[PDB]
Structure 1
């Protein structure tokens, strides 16, 4: 990712692209994925592990959509964006859940809990991206990508034209500016766009709390560990 979405310094270390060269990092990454498939296969093959490889092939369809929009400039929808994020981030949590169940108690039914667990994973995976947005928009990503704020305004008739033409200057010139980004940041704060994502976050929490309570009655005990992860969002 830090090669396809050419990025600068990240968290104190330079991007792996500039150190070992572009051609070398690609080959090292493709090798490690195949190594991981072999470990996964090893531990178990009964119960059909043709659904743990069939669920990795999708993680590459997801990123392909994103690199086509950022390239060909096609504006996203709102429902279409939810699918793109589901394929890319949520599927990794789904793998972890789909392997634990395959060998847990060998006694529990689980028949009526398979669908329930997948419902929990989806909402948590979707949440972690929309919440991550708030930290990026308090910039440096206006070079092609599509946050939730930007998708809300370009669908609101007012000021839709202005921003669409501004971002177009970017992909033609390779980077927006240091001043125009202040213009784009100033538009967002006026129509209260950074307040429409906030009104969605407070909604998704009520869903997760309800979901666990539905699991908390299906032969289960408290989880002061699960309920301690959501507490770290003020």
Structure 2
């Protein structure tokens, strides 16, 4: 009656970003995963819906301060509803997502979600206090979020997997695959400007030599809550001349080698070749 109006208020900021183009690597991963596990279409639908809400809510919490517009006539959610409403809808949406998950123990599910916020905590902490994460810390952070969200999807699918697949023989390789895939996806994605960092930027800072100019723009942007368009150009130009993108390409090639090995290992564990998964891996390049 009047409660439908209240719900419409509560979910208005969510419905806003939920209409944006997703560029669904995650759903393509779940589809590829299900070519092995063969979970009923009805179930993977709910699992997709669950992790999407989880992913969308992550974005709302991430971009609740963002002022830059999303599309042509679509401002940031913050520029429609303000920070407070955005944050409140986001927190509610996560809890609703967890409630939806509880249909497919309790403490285990809660812990899996909470790891995501452990990851975000480190990312936020480092950003706010001006720490450039080492490559090792960068990876651990990715594992606790982008990799973790991927892991949640994998676990839910394994739980609802067809009765003719051996879950215990496969759970091992499946999560090693998931962790490496999320890392590969995140590294690839952070590369597609040149997240807040990149493998190139991180390596350049920590590897060798003085780039006083670079240290100082980052501090400048940090003081201003981000860098301008010119400053970003400047940082890209430094990275391009130091040949630091070549390091990223080296790591990714090795990452594909590790991942192609994991897939074949699983393809042999089951009697199922997975071109879809190998296809997805091949499209996460350079």
User: 1:162 Cα shift?
Assistant: 3.2
User: What's 2:148 paired with?
Assistant: 91
User: 1:121 Cα shift?
Assistant: 0.4
SS at match of 2:74: coil
User: What's 1:31 paired with?
Assistant: 92
Counterparts in 2 of 1:174 and 1:4: CA distance versus 1, 3 Å: closer
Counterparts in 2 of 1:130 and 1:233: CA distance versus 1, 3 Å: closer
Counterparts in 2 of 1:180 and 1:10: CA distance versus 1, 3 Å: same
SS at match of 1:174: coil
User: 1:131 Cα shift?
Assistant: 0.7
Distance in 1 (CA, whole Å) between partners of 2:254 and 2:110 is 33
Q: Deviations over 1:148-204 (max 9, x none)?
A: 111111123323433212321222345444544433222111120111111111111
Contact conserved, 1:61 with 1:87, CA < 8 A, in 2? yes
Distance in 1 (CA, whole Å) between partners of 2:101 and 2:224 is 45
Counterparts in 2 of 1:50 and 1:158: CA distance versus 1, 3 Å: same
Counterparts in 2 of 1:121 and 1:178: CA distance versus 1, 3 Å: closer
Distance in 1 (CA, whole Å) between partners of 2:204 and 2:180 is 24
Q: Which structure is higher in RCO with an 8 Å CA cutoff and minimum separation 6?
A: 2
Contact conserved, 2:116 with 2:144, CA < 8 A, in 1? yes
User: 1:233 Cα shift?
Assistant: 4.7
After TM superposition, the score normalised by the length of structure 2 is: 0.71
Aligned mate of 2:200, from 133, 136, 149: 149
User: 1:6 Cα shift?
Assistant: 5.3
After TM superposition, the score normalised by the length of structure 1 is: 0.85
Contact conserved, 2:220 with 2:227, CA < 8 A, in 1? yes
Contact conserved, 1:153 with 1:159, CA < 8 A, in 2? no
SS at match of 1:13: coil
Structure 1 stretches lacking a partner, 5+ long: 137-143
Counterparts in 2 of 1:233 and 1:36: CA distance versus 1, 3 Å: closer
User: 1:122 Cα shift?
Assistant: 0.5
User: What's 2:20 paired with?
Assistant: none
Counterparts in 2 of 1:169 and 1:25: CA distance versus 1, 3 Å: closer
Contact conserved, 1:77 with 1:151, CA < 8 A, in 2? yes
User: What's 1:140 paired with?
Assistant: none
Which residues in structure 2 correspond to 1:89-128 (within 5 Å)? 89-128=146-185
Q: Does 163-172 or 174-183 show the bigger shift?
A: 174-183
Counterparts in 2 of 1:42 and 1:71: CA distance versus 1, 3 Å: same
The alignment of Structure 1 onto Structure 2 pairs a total of residues equal to: 223
Aligned CA RMSD, in angstroms, stands at 2.3
Contact conserved, 2:115 with 2:144, CA < 8 A, in 1? yes
Counterparts in 2 of 1:107 and 1:170: CA distance versus 1, 3 Å: closer
